[PDB]
Symmetry: C2
């Protein structure tokens, strides 16, 4: 049972803070009632620029019934959150501030007197992810996948039952990629990873197209055709590679056609961006598949800041895993992605 109150957990990023807080519903003390009213006021102010729809209602946490809320706000407003806490007499924002995230340390610097208790991102991620999945999404599906993944322009989002997720392979895609094998609530480890993640995508896009943000890079990619920069098996064999059954549409060499000056001249920014995304997603799908095989795990879930913009990346990842596993593995995703670190921090 957490000492002070109210109960919340935060994931301080370089730009945004992800905060999860618990709203108790069985209240008998006037002081707790206004504590709940203060939290609502705080939420409304901080979010004054979907998350509301992620609210988990009437769940039992630490023996008490309540609603779990999720909000995100600029790290620029974190000092305000802290002061609101002290002004509204929150004992949890008194002692020391617990939190995860990369902007955590940076923040404690800019910030008066305050002692930060830094928690590990991957540890918080795992704990929170497992917890949310255990309490379900208000009885509905917290986990989903894309049926007919082999057809990205036609696949459909469908729920997936992850009752007993164990064992589980968690592929975390941020600037880079960490892959965790989760055997139980307390048994898991980072089995491997790849340096070809979201940072490589944006990094290469910025140099090849001049884009200025992750949002812009993805937008270009959605409009491009990767097969204009990539050399396909068909470009080599004039169709499928019969001998080893490689289909003609399979990518033979990423950016392979960019070795010809002429091809480089006509290739569009949007094409290079989509080719960059396809190279990254197909490679991640391969690493995940081989790791799943080696770990003997058949449930692969993808999380990370890289999946927070468009569903395009998720669909290409589904397409990739389906391809490398010859349809045996399905790429899984979670509705509360982005808030697991926060939830993990709250549990701790």
């Amino acid at each position: 049972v957490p000492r002070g109150s109210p109960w919340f957990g935060m994931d301080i990023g370089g730009t945004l803070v992800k905060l999860s807080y618990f709203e108790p519903i069985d209240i008998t003390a006037e002081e707790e009632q206004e504590e709940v009213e203060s939290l609502k006021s705080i939420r409304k102010y901080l979010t004054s620029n979907r998350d509301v729809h992620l609210e988990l209602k009437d769940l039992t946490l630490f023996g008490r019934r309540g609603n779990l809320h999720f909000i995100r706000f600029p790290t620029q407003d974190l000092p305000t959150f802290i002061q609101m806490g002290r002004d509204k007499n929150f004992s949890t924002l008194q002692t020391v501030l617990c939190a995860t995230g990369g902007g955590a340390y940076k923040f404690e610097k800019d910030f008066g007197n305050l002692h930060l208790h830094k928690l590990d991102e991957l540890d918080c991620l795992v704990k929170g992810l497992l917890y949310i999945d255990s309490v379900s999404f208000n009885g509905q599906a917290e986990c989903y996948y894309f049926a007919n993944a082999s057809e990205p322009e036609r696949c459909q989002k469908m729920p997936f039952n992850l009752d007993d997720p164990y064992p589980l392979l968690v592929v975390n895609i941020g600037s880079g990629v960490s892959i965790l094998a989760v055997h139980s609530k307390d048994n898991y480890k980072r089995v491997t990873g790849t340096s070809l993640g979201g940072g490589t995508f944006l990094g290469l896009c910025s140099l090849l197209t001049g884009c200025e943000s992750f949002e812009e890079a993805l937008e270009m990619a959605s409009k491009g055709d990767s097969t204009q920069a990539d050399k396909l098996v068909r470009d080599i064999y004039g169709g499928d590679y019969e001998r080893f059954g490689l289909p003609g549409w399979a990518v033979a060499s990423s950016f392979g056609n960019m070795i010809y000056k002429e091809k480089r001249e006509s290739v569009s920014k949007e094409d290079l961006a989509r080719a960059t995304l396809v190279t990254i997603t197909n490679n991640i799908g391969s690493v995940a598949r081989m790791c799943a095989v080696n770990e003997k795990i058949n449930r692969v879930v993808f999380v990370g800041n890289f999946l927070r913009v468009n569903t395009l990346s998720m669909k290409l990842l589904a397409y990739a895993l389906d391809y490398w596993s010859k349809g045996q593995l399905k790429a899984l995703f979670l509705e509360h992605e982005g808030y697991f670190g926060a939830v993990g921090a709250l549990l701790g």
Copy 2:
């Protein structure tokens, strides 16, 4: 045993032809003695503009199909291929009387071109099948196989002979524009287990877009002079040192080209640095795929071949480093001296019998 004589095999590429031919040592017939003198004249003509390098590749006094002889290796422009065919015919080679069993991406265009000036059936052989047959034969007959000692330090690692007498099982990583990984269990039992599209063509393609270079040789030259850490984001850039919790050295790459998301970094990064980053990204990834395939296939002998390894020792050393890293010192990357001629040798072994 092959039907015709003399025995040779060719790998026909877009611009050059790789040819391997057998020079028998125990001759009793005058006609064969003449075939041997004819081969030497043909070699001299075709190689008169790598020439000295190929000559040094000659394998002396080995045994092929029961006979003692020398295996020769030459390369010559595909433009002179018709002359080679005519020379053989004029010199009475029976191996060129009706069918030619060759491999190589340019084999078909040759069938098209030559069809208009001669009667010779082309029987196309698969590159990968030739690669494996040749590789297994050359390894069977100094040190043909080598690795780099102290591979964890590319700047000081040293090329050392590696005895590969027990070839099976064997994981063959073929790196061309793309990557094919073959698991070889015995002389006639192997299969393509997987691959990656991030190969040689990816390095050249990206390099040409990022640095403006016009060739593989230039791209690799730029890469040799650059520092990838100027473009890549290391684990230290994020944690200000090592990532204790999960034991990730501060020098490990966290995100390839990950520092290029900042204008400040893009302003100061050099073309040489971007080229090296491109090479590092590709070699580290291939090392990872290979190691995972090795573990899953339960094979601890990983050989790297392919045209991507012909213009530089830098790529070989980087792959050795990558495989050493991913296997935490348990696997050593292997290479072969006759690398570029396996396809041609495989074709020779595939002569009609």
